[PDB]
Amino acid sequence: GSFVEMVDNLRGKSGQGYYVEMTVGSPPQTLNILVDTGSSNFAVGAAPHPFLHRYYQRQLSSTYRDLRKGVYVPYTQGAWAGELGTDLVSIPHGPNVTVRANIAAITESDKFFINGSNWEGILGLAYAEIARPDDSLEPFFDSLVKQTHVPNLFSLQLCGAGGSMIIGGIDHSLYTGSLWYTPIRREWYYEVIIVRVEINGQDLKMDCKEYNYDKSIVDSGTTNLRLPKKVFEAAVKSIKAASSTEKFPDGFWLGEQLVCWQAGTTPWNIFPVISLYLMGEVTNQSFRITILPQQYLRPVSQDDCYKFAISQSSTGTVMGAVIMEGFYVVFDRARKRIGFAVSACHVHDEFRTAAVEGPFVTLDMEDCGYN
Numbered sequence: 579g580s581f582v583e584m585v586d587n588l589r590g591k592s593g594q595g596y597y598v599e600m601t602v603g604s605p606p607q608t609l610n611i612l613v614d615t616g617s618s619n620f621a622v623g624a625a626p627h628p629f630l631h632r633y634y635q636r637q638l639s640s641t642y643r644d645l646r647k648g649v650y651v652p653y654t655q656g657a658w659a660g661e662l663g664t665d666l667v668s669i670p671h672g673p674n675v676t677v678r679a680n681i682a683a684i685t686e687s688d689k690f691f692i693n694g695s696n697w698e699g700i701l702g703l704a705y706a707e708i709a710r711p712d713d714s715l716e717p718f719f720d721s722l723v724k725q726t727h728v729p730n731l732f733s734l735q736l737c738g739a740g741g742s743m744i745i746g747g748i749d750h751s752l753y754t755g756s757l758w759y760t761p762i763r764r765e766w767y768y769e770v771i772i773v774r775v776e777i778n779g780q781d782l783k784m785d786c787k788e789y790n791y792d793k794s795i796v797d798s799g800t801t802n803l804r805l806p807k808k809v810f811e812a813a814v815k816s817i818k819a820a821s822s823t824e825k826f827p828d829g830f831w832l833g834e835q836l837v838c839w840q841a842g843t844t845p846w847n848i849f850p851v852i853s854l855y856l857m858g859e860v861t862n863q864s865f866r867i868t869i870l871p872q873q874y875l876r877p878v879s880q881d882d883c884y885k886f887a888i889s890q891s892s893t894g895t896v897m898g899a900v901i902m903e904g905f906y907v908v909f910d911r912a913r914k915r916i917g918f919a920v921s922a923c924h925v926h927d928e929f930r931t932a933a934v935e936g937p938f939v940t941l942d943m944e945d946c947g948y949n
C-alpha cells in the first residue's frame with residue numbers, strides 16, 4: 579500500500595495510551611504524543627515533571643512564537659496549565675509536510691501525565707468548538723488541512739494486548755471485510771448516534787435516547803467503554819446474567835476489583851459479546867459493531883489480571899479504547915462520517931471474532947439524539 583510508511587507508527591502496549599512521534603521546532607525536538615480524539619488542543623510537557631522523560635524546550639527553538647496568552651485545560655480526567663505559542667510541527671511517520679501549529683507548552687499539571695506511559699504531550703484531534711481557551715484557537719488537524727493538500731481524513735488502528743494512524747487516507751492492510759459509516763452528528767466532539775444495544779444477541783430494550791443521553795462520542799484517549807448510569811446498570815445486569823456460569827464479586831463489575839487467571843487460561847467463552855448498533859448513512863439503515871471480552875476485559879508473573887473496562891459516566895457515552903481496539907476506525911472529516919471495519923490486529927480466539935455487520939432496518943433513529 580502507498581501509506582506503508584505510516585503503518586505501525588503508534589506505540590502503547592503497556593495499556594496507558596497510544597502515542598505518535600511528533601517533531602516540534604527548529605532544530606528538531608521529537609516527543610511522544612498521545613493520540614486523542616476526545617479533545618482539540620495540541621499540548622506538550624514543557625518543564626520537568628516526575629513522570630516525563632523529556633519535554634519541549636522553547637528557548638532552544640528559533641521558530642517558536644510566544645502568543646503571550648495562558649491556557650488552562652481541564653478534562654474528564656486530569657488538568658493542565660501552560661503558555662500558548664506557535665511553532666513548526668511535523669510527524670516523521672505521518673504525512674510528508676510541516677505546518678505551523680498552535681502549541682500549548684505545559685508547565686503545571688494535576689493527574690494528567692501517567693507514570694510509565696512514555697507519552698509527554700497530547701494531540702487533540704477533535705474540532706475547534708471544544709478547544710481551549712475558545713474556538714478561535716485552530717486545532718492541529720485544521721491547520722494541517724488549511725496549510726497543505728493532505729486530504730481531510732485520518733484513520734486509527736489501535737492494537738491491544740502498537741498500531742497505526744494513517745493521515746490523509748485509508749490503508750487496506752489494516753482491516754478485513756467492509757467499512758461501515760455512521761454520521762458525525764455534530765462537529766465538536768466526534769459525536770455519533772447509538773440506536774440499539776445487545777448483550778449476546780439480546781436487546782437491552784432501553785429507549786435509544788438513553789444510549790446518547792447528553793451525547794455519545796469516540797475518544798481514543800479514554801480507556802473504557804463509558805455508558806450513562808441507567809444504561810451501565812442495565813448492561814451490567816445483562817452481562818452478569820449471560821456470564822452466570824461463574825460468579826464474580828459486585829466490585830468487579832464496578833472496576834473496583836480485579837480477577838486473575840493462570841497464564842493462558844482465561845475462559846473468554848463464558849463472557850458475552852456486546853453489540854452497539856450505530857445510525858447508518860441511509861434512511862432507516864443501521865449497522866452493528868460487536869466486541870468480545872478480549873476488548874472489554876483489559877489486562878493490568880504466572881497470573882493474568884483483568885479489569886472490567888465498561889464503566890459509568892455522567893457526561894454521556896464514551897467509546898474509548900475498549901471499542902477502538904476491535905476495529906480500524908476511519909475519521910472521515912471531509913464527509914462528516916466515521917467508518918468501522920474489523921481490525922487486522924484485534925485480539926480474539928478461534929471461536930469468536932470482533933464483527934462489523936449490516937445492514938439492519940431501524941426506524942425513527944433521528945429520535946435517538948439529545949437536544
Ligand SMILES: C[C@@H](NC(=O)c1cc(COC(=O)[C@](C)(N)Cc2ccccc2)cc(N(C)S(C)(=O)=O)c1)c1ccc(F)cc1
Pocket residue numbers: 593594595596612614616617653654655656690700797798799800801802803804889898899
Ligand atoms: C490516556 C489513557 N486514558 C485514561 O486513562 C482515561 C482518560 C479519561 C478521560 O479522557 C479525556 O478526558 C481525554 C479527552 N481523552 C483527555 C485525557 C485525559 C487524561 C489522560 C489522557 C487524555 C477517562 C478515563 N476514565 C474515567 S475510564 C477509566 O472510565 O476510561 C481514563 C488511555 C487511553 C487509551 C488507552 F488505550 C489506555 C489508556
